[PDB]
Each structure stands twice: as structure tokens, then as C-alpha cells.
Amino acid sequence: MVLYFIGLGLYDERDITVKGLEIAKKCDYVFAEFYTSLMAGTTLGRIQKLIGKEIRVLSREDVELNFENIVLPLAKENDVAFLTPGDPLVATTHAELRIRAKRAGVESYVIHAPSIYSAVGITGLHIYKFGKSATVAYPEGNWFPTSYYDVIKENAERGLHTLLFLDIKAEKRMYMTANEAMELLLKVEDMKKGGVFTDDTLVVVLARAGSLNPTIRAGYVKDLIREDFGDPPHILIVPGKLHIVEAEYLVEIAGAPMEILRVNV
Amino acid sequence: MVLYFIGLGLYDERDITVKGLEIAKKCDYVFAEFYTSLMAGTTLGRIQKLIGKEIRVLSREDVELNFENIVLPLAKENDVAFLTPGDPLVATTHAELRIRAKRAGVESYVIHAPSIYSAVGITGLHIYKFGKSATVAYPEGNWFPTSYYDVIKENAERGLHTLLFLDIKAEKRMYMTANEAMELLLKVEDMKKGGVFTDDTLVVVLARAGSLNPTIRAGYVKDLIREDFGDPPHILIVPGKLHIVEAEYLVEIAGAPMEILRVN
Numbered sequence: 295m296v297l298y299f300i301g302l303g304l305y306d307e308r309d310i311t312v313k314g315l316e317i318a319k320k321c322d323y324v325f326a327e328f329y330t331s332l333m334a335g336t337t338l339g340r341i342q343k344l345i346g347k348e349i350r351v352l353s354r355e356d357v358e359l360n361f362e363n364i365v366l367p368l369a370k371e372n373d374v375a376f377l378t379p380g381d382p383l384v385a386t387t388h389a390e391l392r393i394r395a396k397r398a399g400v401e402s403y404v405i406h407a408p409s410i411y412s413a414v415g416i417t418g419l420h421i422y423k424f425g426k427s428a429t430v431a432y433p434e435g436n437w438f439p440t441s442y443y444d445v446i447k448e449n450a451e452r453g454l455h456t457l458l459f460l461d462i463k464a465e466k467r468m469y470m471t472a473n474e475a476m477e478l479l480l481k482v483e484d485m486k487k488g489g490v491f492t493d494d495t496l497v498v499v500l501a502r503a504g505s506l507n508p509t510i511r512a513g514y515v516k517d518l519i520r521e522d523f524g525d526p527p528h529i530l531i532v533p534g535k536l537h538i539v540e541a542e543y544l545v546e547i548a549g550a551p552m553e554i555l556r557v558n559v
Numbered sequence: 560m561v562l563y564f565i566g567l568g569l570y571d572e573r574d575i576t577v578k579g580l581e582i583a584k585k586c587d588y589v590f591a592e593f594y595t596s597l598m599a600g601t602t603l604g605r606i607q608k609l610i611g612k613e614i615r616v617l618s619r620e621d622v623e624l625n626f627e628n629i630v631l632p633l634a635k636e637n638d639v640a641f642l643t644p645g646d647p648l649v650a651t652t653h654a655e656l657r658i659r660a661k662r663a664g665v666e667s668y669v670i671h672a673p674s675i676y677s678a679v680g681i682t683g684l685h686i687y688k689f690g691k692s693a694t695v696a697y698p699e700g701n702w703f704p705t706s707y708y709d710v711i712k713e714n715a716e717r718g719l720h721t722l723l724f725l726d727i728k729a730e731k732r733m734y735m736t737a738n739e740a741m742e743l744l745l746k747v748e749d750m751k752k753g754g755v756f757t758d759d760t761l762v763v764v765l766a767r768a769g770s771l772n773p774t775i776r777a778g779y780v781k782d783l784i785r786e787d788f789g790d791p792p793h794i795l796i797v798p799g800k801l802h803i804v805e806a807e808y809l810v811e812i813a814g815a816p817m818e819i820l821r822v823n
């Protein structure tokens with residue numbers, strides 16, 4: 295008679311919480327989705343072996359169109375789990391799935407797990423300084439979206455950091471790169487010319503957060519745009535003016551140039 | 560011969576990730592602090608029991624003044640772990656401790672945990688629409704902090720939600736309730752009169768995130784400022800402009816007034 299939204303965490307099969315696991319193991323049915331994001335540090339197979347349960351994967355339309363016909367029904371006579379990467383309800387559409395459950399007269403509980411939203415704290419940037427967040431999307435056809443560029447301007451203007459999620463084709467397993475993203479932002483700057491993103495903009499790239507060996511690199515576009523950050527997914531962040539302690543952290547941990555100590559503080 | 564920053568999670572000792580549990584288990588020395596936040600659903604004894612280790616609990620002074628004297632030293636000949644509530648680097652100054660470790664030639668690793676910063680997702684408010692965050696601090700003597708007021712103001716002009724961490728005086732065992740925060744804000748409103756936080760302001764309260772039954776309530780200040788949201792810890796959120804589905808969640812799940820649907 296219960297539905298459990300359980301987060302899988304950041305990178306691999308051990309990023310689930312001890313709570314999430316013990317609850318997942320005692321569920322009659324376990325569903326999962328990997329369209330919002332991919333657990334790039336593990337496999338479906340490794341997740342099932344840790345949870346010790348057959349895991350039925352769900353497509354975007356499985357969830358968004360038929361959540362109440364695929365998942366909810368089983369919750370009336372059973373305890374059901376719904377696993378998602380990161381922290382549940384972070385993806386903007388997932389919270390209404392709870393409204394669906396209430397509507398179908400189903401009890402729903404949320405078991406949290408690490409999200410990149412809090413994990414970027416490893417970049418050294420202060421969490422209270424992050425402003426609005428956005429996603430960089432590919433242009434295509436006659437559509438050239440650039441709102442994420444305005445988010446950067448409005449945040450940085452107010453001395454706040456911008457967390458930038460990169461385009462993902464979960465299903466086709468193709469990630470946007472930090473590099474790709476920097477090129478796109480450069481192209482946008484040339485269209486709008488607002489001084490928001492240029493070769494001298496300082497940025498932070500975070501890759502494989504959650505892993506014991508993530509990649510935290512900080513520097514100016516001109517030096518980073520062709521750097522090898524590794525395998526995806528990448529997270530791009532455009533900091534606002536830094537607190538000296540943030541810059542020292544980017545220098546000593548993320549390998550940023552001494553120059554940001556006098557340029558970006 | 561390494562140091563690990565391992566988050567313990569939101570509510571009880573089970574909010575630790577499987578990765579953090581199996582690593583803290585094999586560490587020679589385990590340190591911890593419980594002054595940056597409150598894990599309402601557990602005790603030191605159960606953490607210890609679950610980790611299978613003795614946890615030396617540090618104070619803010621131990622940490623801020625003697626981290627390099629208490630903890631890094633043991634890191635050259637042993638594997639040391641430093642536990643904290645929620646996520647170790649979020650809304651703490653712990654990231655600076657990594658610098659100390661490096662400057663002492665001690666490599667450090669971070670094991671994340673569920674943080675209250677992303678748990679806000681359970682309020683139904685889109686996490687990307689949150690703007691600059693702030694902390695509501697207790698007035699000390701003649702000193703009355705008010706900067707958090709301007710933060711709410713900036714975000715709301717932008718239409719973004721504001722996350723308000725609430726103060727904590729761990730040594731006195733005092734945890735600011737959302738009620739207390741709402742009262743502090745009202746008097747700042749009388750002070751500044753910037754029409755930012757009034758009796759008619761819609762707010763959201765999230766209490767004890769991480770537990771199976773957190774308290775999630777939304778509604779106008781006048782109705783909530785005296786309401787009992789249960790034990791600490793609490794956070795207070797002053798949303799910006801709502802999306803209809805945000806508002807639908809707040810009404811269906813957090814018990815807000817239907818009128819808030821009319822999202823202008």
C-alpha cells in the first residue's frame with residue numbers, strides 16, 4: 295500500500311543510502327528510470343546485484359504518460375520502489391508524480407540521496423552564492439535557445455554563481471561536453487554581445503562527482519575550451535565574483551591559475 | 560594515510576550512503592562534528608554502532624582552530640574519517656579544511672550525503688528556480704542581523720524562490736524554528752518596510768527532511784507563524800513566482816490555500 299521514491303545518488307551503485315537500500319530490498323516491486331540522467335559509474339546489472347531485485351526500467355513516456363497505469367496499480371496491494379538517479383523530486387517533473395499517487399489514493403514516501411545540486415559544493419564555491427540554474431541545450435532547425443545565457447548574466451550581475459546542466463540524450467547515450475558547452479556559449483555571446491561569456495570568463499568544470507576521483511578543474515575559457523575533462527556527464531559552472539576563500543580553493547584543489555586571485559576576487 | 564570527509568545525511572544514521580558506510584568502517588580513526596546541523600532521528604551511540612567505531616566528536620573551536628593539530632596529524636600513518644550531518648561541504652566552511660589538509664601533504668576525499676539543499680525538492684518547488692540562499696541568524700545583544708531580508712527581496716524581484724537556513728547554537732542545544740524565523744522577519748519588515756515579508760506572504764516550511772514523515776506545510780505567514788511544525792531542524796522558504804504545478808503540489812501535498820493556484 296506504499297510507494298517509495300528512492301534516489302540512487304551521483305555515480306555508482308554504492309551512492310544509494312543505507313536507508314534507500316534496506317527499503318528497496320523489502321519492496322515487492324522495483325522500478326527505475328534513466329532518462330533524466332545516467333549512472334555513469336555503474337551498470338544496471340551492478341545495481342540489481344546490490345539491491346538483489348529484478349529492476350524494471352521505465353521510459354520517459356512510461357513515467358510521464360502511464361505512471362498511474364504501470365507503477366501505482368502495484369502499490370495498492372504491494373510496497374513499490376521507484377528509483378531515480380540523484381535525489382528524488384529534483385527533476386522538475388517528478389514532484390507531480392506524487393500528486394498522481396495521492397490522487398490514486400497511494401501513500402508515498404521519499405528517501406533522499408546525494409544530488410549534484412549539493413555535490414558541486416566540492417568545487418569550493420559557497421552554496422548560498424548559487425543563483426538560478428539552467429540547462430544548455432543544442433540549437434536545432436530554426437530553433438536557437440539562449441535563455442541559459444540570460445541566467446548567467448542575471449546571476450553573475452548579482453555576484454551569484456550559475457550551475458549549468460549540459461544537454462543529455464539519455465536514450466542515445468550522448469552527452470554534451472563541457473567543451474561543446476563552452477563553444478555554444480561563445481557562439482551565443484557573439485550573437486547577444488553582453489560580455490557575459492568570453493575567452494576571459496572564468497569557469498569551473500566538474501565531472502564524475504560522487505566518484506572518489508572526480509575531475510574538478512577551474513580556469514579561463516581560452517585555456518579550458520579544448521581541455522580533456524574525461525568522460526561525461528560534465529557540469530559547467532560560471533562563478534560570480536569570488537570570495538578569497540573560494541578562489542584559494544579553486545587554486546589549491548581545482549588547479550586554477552594564481553591570476554584569479556587578483557582578477558576574480 | 561588519508562582523510563575522508565563523509566556526510567551522514569539528513570535525519571538518521573541510515574541516510575549515510577553505502578559508500579560512506581563501508582569506508583568509515585575501514586578507517587583507523589573517526590572524527591565528527593554535530594554543530595553545523597541537527598540529525599533529529601539518531602544519536603552518537605547508533606552512529607558509532609552502525610560504523611562499528613569510536614567517534615571522537617569535535618567542537619567548532621577544535622575544528623576551526625585545531626583541525627590541522629587534531630585531525631591531519633593522524634592522517635599520515637592512518638586512514639582518518641571526518642563525519643558531519645548532511646553533506647560535509649554544503650553551507651559549511653569545511654571546504655577550507657581541504658586546503659589545510661593539502662598544505663599538510665594529506666590527500667582528502669569527499670563522500671557526499673543527502674543535503675537539505677536538494678531535499679527542498681520535496682516541497683514541490685522546482686529546484687532550478689531557487690535563487691541566492693541565506694541564513695536567518697539569532698540577534699546577539701544589540702546586534703540584529705538583517706541581510707537575509709535583502710536576499711529574499713532580490714530573489715523575489717527575479718521571481719526566484721529563497722532558501723533560508725535557520726540558525727543553530729549547538730552548545731546551547733537551540734535550533735531556530737521556522738516560527739522564530741517568521742517573527743524575526745516581520746520585525747525586520749517593520750524596520751525596513753520594504754514590503755518583502757508580511758502577514759500575507761506565502762511561505763513553505765520543511766521540518767525534519769529525511770524522516771519518513773517530514774512536515775511539509777505552505778500558506779500565508781499570518782496563519783503559520785503560530786503553527787506547530789514539530790521538532791527541529793526546520794528551514795523556511797519564501798517562494799518567488801509559482802508555476803501552476805508548483806502551486807498544485809503545495810495545495811495537494813503541503814496543504815496550501817487553493818487561492819494560490821491563481822499564479823498571476
Ligand SMILES: Nc1ncnc2c1ncn2[C@@H]1O[C@H](CSCC[C@H](N)C(=O)O)[C@@H](O)[C@H]1O
Nearest residue numbers: 569596645646649674675725767768792793
Ligand atoms: N533534515 C533537515 N530538515 C530541515 N532542515 C534541515 C535539515 N538538515 C539541515 N537543515 C537546515 O540547515 C541548517 C544547517 S546548514 C548545514 C547543512 C548541511 N551541510 C546539509 O548538507 O544539509 C539547519 O539549521 C536547518 O535550518
